[PDB]
Design a protein around this ligand. Structure first.
Ligand code: EGE
Length: 127
């Protein structure tokens, strides 16, 4: 098996804007999750060669990871905070799709997802 190229993280032609939500998504949400004890499997694209997962990209057609999300936020790749929230949810659900209920890695994603939901609950929407 061979990996796909990572998701795009930079497009010089896309319009750029900074919002309080995007700022919070990067400075608080991504930062908090990145430092979580369970973060390390999700900090870069799944390397199915290095991890000996030859069917991963046969099953996962929309890969996503927090290293990509970090780059997207940093490059002003997102226009809407919802695009970022969706990438986080793609990352969590990818793990659920590839693995099985009760798997350790699925419990780890579930814990990260709970933390994620607690943090976006406090998203600044002009407070
Ligand atoms: N499954 C994985 C698949 C992967 O692809 C990668 C990766 O690519 O990096 C890492 C993975 N890691 N898998 C772990 C499984 C258990 C533990 S654990 O020692 O903390 N034990 C428990 C037990 C129950 C609940 C929580 N943790 C740590 C990591």
């Amino acid at each position: 098996s061979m990996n796909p190229p990572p998701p795009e993280t930079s497009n010089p032609n896309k319009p750029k804007r900074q919002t309080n939500q995007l700022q919070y998504l990067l400075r608080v949400v991504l930062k908090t999750l990145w430092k979580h004890q369970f973060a390390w499997p999700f900090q870069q694209p799944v390397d199915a060669v290095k991890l000996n997962l030859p069917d991963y990209y046969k099953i996962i057609k929309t890969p996503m990871d927090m290293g990509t999300i970090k780059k997207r936020l940093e490059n002003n790749y997102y226009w809407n905070a919802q695009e970022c929230i969706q990438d986080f949810n793609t990352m969590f659900t990818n793990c659920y799709i590839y693995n099985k209920p009760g798997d350790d890695i699925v419990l780890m994603a579930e814990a990260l997802e709970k933390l994620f939901l607690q943090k976006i609950n406090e998203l600044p929407t002009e407070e």
